[PDB]
Amino acid sequence: HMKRLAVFASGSGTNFQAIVDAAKRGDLPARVALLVCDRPGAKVIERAARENVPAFVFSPKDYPSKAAFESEILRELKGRQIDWIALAGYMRLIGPTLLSAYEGKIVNIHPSLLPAFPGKDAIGQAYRAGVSETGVTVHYVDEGMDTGPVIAQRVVPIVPGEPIEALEERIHQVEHELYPTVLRMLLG
Ligand SMILES: [Mg+2]
Ligand SMILES: [Mg+2]
Structure with missing residues (x-):
């Protein structure tokens, strides 16, 4: 029984594409079974359609609360027999409704070497801080924000003057390589 993965994404969908491409070439022993998107019109939706991935x-504007829409997402996830959730550019926090149902089965990719620079715009944070290096982290999602256990990391240097x-381009390149590799081992 191959694990079924749901990818949550809110934007361009480049990480989603990397995951889909890996599965397509036979390097991901899991089914990219669903795209959950909280932003109608997002380019990632078009990608799912082109790749024949249900979406x-x-x-969020059509719901009174996060619990309200996560309740529907949960029904959808269970009905589609989703086993794991990978956040890839999902621009909002996962609430207790989903955290409880998929505890230990939700992962996220973050553009910093956690626990360093958690939170939004971590690429900008590291750049603004003036540090000499940063990185990319794939981690488990838990109650905290970008605080769940680290699964894998890749160091990325920040070149003075650049x-x-x-x-950003360097970090994205790394994310596209690292996420599919981590998912392959997590779901294999
Ligand atoms: Mg090959
Ligand atoms: Mg409806």
């Missing part, structure tokens, strides 16, 4: 798209664009 559950919703707007624009932030240089660091």
